[PDB]
Ligand binder design. Structure first.
Ligand SMILES: Cc1cc2nc3c(=O)[nH]c(=O)nc-3n(C[C@H](O)[C@H](O)[C@H](O)COP(=O)(O)OP(=O)(O)OC[C@H]3O[C@@H](n4cnc5c(N)ncnc54)[C@H](O)[C@@H]3O)c2cc1C
Ligand SMILES: Cc1cc2nc3c(=O)[nH]c(=O)nc-3n(C[C@H](O)[C@H](O)[C@H](O)COP(=O)(O)OP(=O)(O)OC[C@H]3O[C@@H](n4cnc5c(N)ncnc54)[C@H](O)[C@@H]3O)c2cc1C
Lengths: 442, 442
């Protein structure tokens, strides 16, 4: 239905939260309800000393259900992948919503405590709009509306259903781990319970004192882990890069991809003949998979209606937001290689004006063309589908900003669209160098 | 031995950390080593979504060993009693060390996030002096020194031993739960696994939505819990006060102490005949027990050498710091009803000057007299032994401030002793009113 009055937001993390404020700023909707399985908003910024109960090794299925840690004396806990000593890899000049600045004297790459407090503040006025400790089981178009099925998190809660005109899925994409099925991995992992970890389980580095570790992966997370393990793990630290690396010294030995895990001898074979033995911990820093764990959406498999396939990305979403077949279904926060808060805010502001009717989407065929062209430029690398590495991200948010400006009628209070000027872009372009200089690395 | 060179500090929380800086500032010790079972410093300020594995119900033994939650993929976690939405009950104008202020724009009674960050900043330069993830098993005077036995937290670590000339115990006193043994409690607790809780298990209030709750206790913690449960628990919330209470309305029904727990009818008898039934959760906010879990110290039972008896306090400690029989053994952080950070700094400042010899303690008989007089003024209420409720804390910290000022020789850099002038004392005196007005309560 075009006239949208009741909206459901799946998730109360940074993306769902900014989506709510933008929607509520339209003064056009009668109901905006956020659903959150955690007892509080903030998404992954809810640091949990608790680890996931069972790591799937290997992990290649994007539909995997997240099992919360439960007990008789506590609300169920959904572990967050944030680790103890984490500091941002995004500067305060760029991260964070454009209309809530950081307090003065804040470190440029602050500890998570600062971001957890920043989110707590941001979300406080939204609490009455959120159904906390509530897990959304399924989402499906029935008649002319969306039927969202959910169950209160808490033993004995009854399954319930409510219907909305639109649904914005902001469930995040850093929950289902991605661990490639390698020869002998499974058996290797099960023979020694904590010998095979993933980055989502990392919390405290003191666990690795004296141990010989093999970090697998070459992304930012893998490199960050190597630096964090360097002062504690036994030297050297091994890092398995896809094409091998140029660093081979006393503290770090970069090696090629893994060929096979020898369950019997506990040896690890690397492409090129190199073989590692006596590895106490193998930590996969291979990222996660996109997920749409809602049976009615997950079953969709046709090229024009599918959302998920291999979890490399979410398909059929115009501008990475609107589900082409039916734009009353949207996503906020799918962007990869971006500054999270600002980017989700740019999408929320646009999403709000389109759903209220102050802005119109181009034709269904044009939206589909936008996709064809993207798919073509990916040359088969679908995990880059939602990637907006600079300058794509700067251009993207400025594009959404300029579009939002065209909304009509003009409202007395306009929910802002972030905008990156010459200065903001320069910082984003040299982000990793500014970060490297801040932490005295590289 | 009087010439102290090597000092061991048990615990790397607010107390052990400020004791480290005060000691190092004397420039008179060759070795200052902090031991800490947790992976990081900061004491209880390490928020843990992880609950204690097994709540002892009832709990009356102060020697009870703290069991950390362990797993094959993580460093052992020692759950903290801090809850999710916790904000301080001490204003920034007084809490915190006198030589480290809070950043600008900090809330008068900040969320734990702010305080966890504060402790992180304060403890950072001390990381190389702390043996992290290390549990001290025992402490005993052997020959002329103190032998401290410890084991690295982490499966398989070997039991190790090191000697020191002095030992400062800063193990905290809010770990071992105190739950009075009432008739039928044990059975009533074991019948329904999560029916009986302790304040140390509280984390997220959404777990109590719709439930009927009995909060037992009249101290601050109990009243805080009542307010936090008010918007979620089924009305009214029951609070068992020792002498009953004056509040009886739709949302809060204060009642007298508990007489018995009827396992069979799950009924709760209150002094005066009043009986409660259909209580989903009973939350004991009856506080904690002081604990000295070191065999060589816990076995001491003679009047002149005992440290712990019923866990109401730690005996034989001159000024709540020096163990009278052997002052090379001291405690920091025992104070009750005080503003923690400053008060522990006031002690550390004094302890440091005494142990380096720049200050001298009075005679042993004069120390014992100080204790006799304290015991006399207590009138049998031993759990008030370490209580320094204003103006006692104000006078105490200022007394230590003035003593430290007499240390000689003067050092180029003098570790500061907090001091509470007319302004400070004022805030301390009306602290609970200022707090009430801040959170708009009472
Ligand atoms: C290790 C790590 C480090 C990071 N460091 C930074 C950094 O330094 N800077 C930065 O800007 N970003 C960082 N990020 C990125 C982070 O993803 C974003 O900051 C931000 O959390 C994006 O949030 P969201 O709402 O899109 O996702 P999330 O924070 O993942 O929130 C999703 C929310 O939806 C809920 N939810 C999911 N499914 C359901 C369901 N079925 N029913 C009900 N609720 C559901 C979740 O429980 C959760 O609260 C990091 C991420 C990781 C994993
Ligand atoms: C629910 C709650 C709320 C509070 N709110 C406030 C507040 O708002 N403001 C305020 O000022 N104070 C508050 N406090 C008080 C708090 O006790 C102090 O702020 C501060 O933590 C004092 O710490 P410490 O070093 O004395 O103790 P702790 O913080 O308890 O630290 C003791 C440390 O020693 C370690 N340890 C113990 N035994 C051993 C061993 N055998 N071997 C190795 N390490 C060991 C522990 O693991 C721990 O890290 C609160 C306390 C609780 C329980």
């Amino acid at each position: 239905l075009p006239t949208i009055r009741k909206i459901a937001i799946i998730g109360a993390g940074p993306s769902g939260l900014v989506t709510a404020k933008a929607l509520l700023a339209e003064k056009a909707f009668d109901q905006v309800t956020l659903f959150e399985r955690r007892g509080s908003p903030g998404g992954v910024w809810n640091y949990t000393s608790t680890l996931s109960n069972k790591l799937p090794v290997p992990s290649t299925n994007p539909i995997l259900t997240t099992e919360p840690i439960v007990g008789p004396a506590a609300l169920p806990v959904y572990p967050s992948p944030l680790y103890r000593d984490l500091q941002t890899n995004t500067p305060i000049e760029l991260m964070g919503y454009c209309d809530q600045s950081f307090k003065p004297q804040t470190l440029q790459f602050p500890h998570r405590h600062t971001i957890q407090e920043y989110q707590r503040i941001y979300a406080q006025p939204l609490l009455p709009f959120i159904k906390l400790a509530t897990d959304v089981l399924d989402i499906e178009k029935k008649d002319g509306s969306w039927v969202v099925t959910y169950k209160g998190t808490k033993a004995g809660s009854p399954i319930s259903k409510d219907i909305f005109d639109a649904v914005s899925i902001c469930n995040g994409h850093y929950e289902v781990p991605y661990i490639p099925n390698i020869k002998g991995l499974d058996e290797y992992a099960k023979a020694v319970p904590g010998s095979v970890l993933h980055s989502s389980l990392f919390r405290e580095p003191e666990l690795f004192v004296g141990e010989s570790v093999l970090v697998v992966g070459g992304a930012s997370s893998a490199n960050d882990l190597v630096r964090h393990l360097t002062p504690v793990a036994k030297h050297p630290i091994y890092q398995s890069l896809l094409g091998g690396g140029d660093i081979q010294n006393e503290s770090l030995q970069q090696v090629p991809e893994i060929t096979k895990f020898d369950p019997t001898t506990r040896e690890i074979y690397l492409k090129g003949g190199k073989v590692l033995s006596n590895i106490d911990r193998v930590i996969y820093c291979t990222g996660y998979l996109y997920s749409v764990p809602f049976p009615s959406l997950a079953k969709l498999k046709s090229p024009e209606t599918k959302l998920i396939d291999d979890g490399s990305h979410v398909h059929n979403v115009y501008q990475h937001i609107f589900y082409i077949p039916d734009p009353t279904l949207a996503f906020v926060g799918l962007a990869l290689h971006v500054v999270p808060f600002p980017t989700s805010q740019a999408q929320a502001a646009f999403l709000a004006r389109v759903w209220s009717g102050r802005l119109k989407l181009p034709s269904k065929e044009e939206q589909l063309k936008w996709q064809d062209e993207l798919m073509f430029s990916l040359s088969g690398a679908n995990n880059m589908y939602h990637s907006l590495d600079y300058p794509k991200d700067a251009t993207y948010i400025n594009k959404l900003h300029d579009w939002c400006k065209q909304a009509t009628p003009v409202l007395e209070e306009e929910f802002p669209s972030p905008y990156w000027g010459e200065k903001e872009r320069s910082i984003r372009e040299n982000m990793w160098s500014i970060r490297a200089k801040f932490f005295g690395i590289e």
